[PDB]
């Protein structure tokens, strides 16, 4: 609703979405199949500025969630049903270090935005007592 409140809430939502994507990627570092039988392709969120009516500055909105285009890892298990004619099973391209660092940075941004929102709310509470 309130601008800075809108900005901080949108940014909290975006950082929570990034953290959830990173956690799901970290869970699926060793996953070999999904429901359809396709390999799990790592997800990554896309951030975009939410300043549609606010010129060039605004909140951050998650435009989409996209499968990373890094090449899939290949493991030689010719007995696996998912192995192709060459005997290679496709395993996800999830980078463990990148996901851990993403989780940590997203947590820090989340906390910073919460502190910003608290300070702004306190400032309006004090504004509510102008002239008295």
């Amino acid at each position: 609703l309130l601008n800075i409140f809108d900005i901080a809430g949108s940014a909290l939502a975006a950082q929570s979405k990034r953290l959830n994507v990173a956690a799901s990627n970290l869970a699926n570092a060793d996953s070999v199949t999904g429901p359809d039988g396709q390999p799990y392709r790592a997800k990554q969120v896309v951030f975009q500025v939410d300043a549609a009516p606010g010129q060039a500055t605004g909140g951050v909105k998650v435009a989409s969630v996209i499968e990373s285009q890094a090449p899939e890892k290949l493991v030689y298990e010719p007995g696996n049903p998912l192995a192709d004619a060459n005997g290679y099973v496709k395993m996800p391209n999830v980078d463990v270090v990148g996901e851990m660092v993403n989780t940590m940075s997203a947590s820090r941004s989340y906390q910073a935005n919460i502190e910003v929102l608290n300070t702004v709310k306190s400032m309006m509470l004090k504004t509510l007592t102008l002239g008295q």
Binding site: A22, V46, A70
Partner: peptide, 16 residues
């Protein structure tokens, strides 16, 4: 605009 935040962007990539 913007792209993938975090690990994927802050990693060297082949020029394209």
């Amino acid at each position: 605009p913007g792209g993938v935040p975090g690990a994927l962007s802050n990693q060297p990539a082949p020029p394209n």
